[PDB]
Amino acid sequence: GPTEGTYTLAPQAVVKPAGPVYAPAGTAKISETLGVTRTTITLTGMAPYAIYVAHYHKMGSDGPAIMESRMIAQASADGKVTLTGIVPTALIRDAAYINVHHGRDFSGALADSGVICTPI
Amino acid sequence: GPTEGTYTLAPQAVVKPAGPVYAPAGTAKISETLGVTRTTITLTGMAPYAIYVAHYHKMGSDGPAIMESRMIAQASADGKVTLTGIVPTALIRDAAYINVHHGRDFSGALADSGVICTPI
């Protein structure tokens, strides 16, 4: 007795997503010691799997970036990036805003031009 | 170390994408030798790392692709793809146009139905 029922399925109408909500948010901890600076930007609610280059943009907003401060990292499966970087203080002198961007490659690259920025 | 710092993040107002700009341009160059035809087409401003299948479509704009004139290549990382090929001039005797399409895979079907086209 192989009770068998064949049912055609309907194409649905409600296809809302299910996973990390892209809601950028976080904090920064720039800590000076003996002429060196250690910066830790823990972000949450980011893209689930994405490289997030972050550097120090100088004042000028546009402004150049002291690229000797590029902190690179990728996110997890919920969207948690932890940028960490060591930069001489004399280098980061005259910096204005730590701008986080998106990374086209693990070698760096600025896919996006500022998904989140903090005044320093 | 002796100095600390803690800054919460702010997601700017507008984030702008950078890198290549999708501005399709091109430069077709045929050179029909003894019963043979070479075709070197240089496309700049294309999609960063995409496939670019190119054929000679007959009249009937619209009309059938001479499939024996396919040229395939990738667009580097700034959108620069170079298409070269060699086809007897007898088969392409009724070609009216050289239609460049996007590709689904290496040596395969189209993903578009003609991005850029030159009349011959």
Partner: peptide, 26 residues
């Protein structure tokens, strides 16, 4: 009129395209 919701949907899709691109690129 009522196309304000349409603008909101357009903004959501604009952000979604970038999110998909970034996740897949990563």
């Amino acid at each position: 009129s009522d196309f304000d919701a349409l603008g909101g949907r357009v903004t959501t899709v604009e952000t979604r395209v970038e999110t998909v691109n970034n996740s897949l690129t990563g």
